[PDB]
Every structure is written in C-alpha cells, then in structure tokens.
Amino acid sequence: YSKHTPINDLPQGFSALEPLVDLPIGINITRFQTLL
Amino acid sequence: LTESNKKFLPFQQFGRDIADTTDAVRDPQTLEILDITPCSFGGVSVITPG
Ligand SMILES: *[C@@H]1O[C@H](CO)[C@@H](O)[C@H](O)[C@H]1NC(C)=O
Ligand SMILES: *[C@@H]1O[C@H](CO)[C@@H](O)[C@H](O)[C@H]1NC(C)=O
C-alpha cells in the first residue's frame, strides 16, 4: 500500500494509504532491509 | 444490474452498504458500476368478501 502527501516530520493530518500492489505468492519473510 | 451513480476508487471492485450485503459491483471488462438490487418479492394477500 502506498500514499504520497505534501507537507511544509509526520504531520498531524489524516490520509489513508491506497492499495496499489498485490504482488503474487512468496514464502516466509521474517526479515527485511532497505536498499540505501 | 442497473447503472449506478456511485463512483468507486480506482482500486475498488466491491460495493457494500451497511448490511454486509453487496450493493454495487465494478464490471471487470468494461469499467462501470452496476447496482445489485435484489429481485422483487413480497407476500400475496387475498381480499375476499367471504
Ligand atoms: C516459515 O514458513 C515456512 C514455509 O515453508 C514454514 O517452515 C514455517 O511456517 C516458517 N518457518 C519457520 C518458522 O522456521
Ligand atoms: C478489454 O480491453 C479494454 C480494457 O478494459 C476494454 O475497453 C475492452 O472492452 C475489453 N474487451 C475487449 C474485447 O477488448
């Protein structure tokens, strides 16, 4: 699910995240990391 | 399945009111919203003068 919002820092505003991707089946994922 | 004035979100397929009952469907092939009003039904009373 993703959402992109503009601000002037997590704002106090409210915005629901629209689903966009439902990638097919995988196996157990218990760990992750970001590609810096 | 009649045409409806509702406007779904681009990812939304189901349509539901507050009854846990489907009341709108986005058509897969052509992208339109159709109503799911149930087929008419009701009791049948008989008026007789005896
Ligand atoms: C993660 O999923 C696998 C599926 O093959 C299963 O062994 C189990 O549910 C999990 N593995 C663990 C807890 O070692
Ligand atoms: C599939 O292609 C588009 C995508 O929704 C649609 O307009 C069209 O009516 C569909 N059917 C066919 C036969 O192209």
Swiss-Prot record, chain A:
It comes from the Viruses. Changing A16V: In strain: 20A.EU1. Glycans are attached at N28. Attaches the virion to the cell membrane by interacting with host receptor, initiating the infection. The major receptor is host ACE2. When S2/S2' has been cleaved, binding to the receptor triggers direct fusion at the cell membrane. When S2/S2' has not been cleaved, binding to the receptor results in internalization of the virus by endocytosis using host TFRC and GRM2 and leading to fusion of the virion membrane with the host endosomal membrane. Alternatively, may use NRP1/NRP2 and integrin as entry receptors. Binds to host ACE2. RBD also interacts with the N-linked glycan on 'Asn-90' of ACE2. Cleavage of S generates a polybasic C-terminal sequence on S1 that binds to host Neuropilin-1 (NRP1) and Neuropilin-2 (NRP2) receptors. Interacts with host integrin alpha-5/beta-1 (ITGA5:ITGB1) and with ACE2 in complex with integrin alpha-5/beta-1 (ITGA5:ITGB1). May interact via cytoplasmic c-terminus with M protein. May interact (via N-terminus) with host bilirubin and biliverdin, thereby preventing antibody binding to the SARS-CoV-2 spike NTD via an allosteric mechanism. This is Spike protein S1. It comes from Severe acute respiratory syndrome coronavirus 2. The gene is S. The chain holds residues 204 to 242 of 1273 of the full protein.
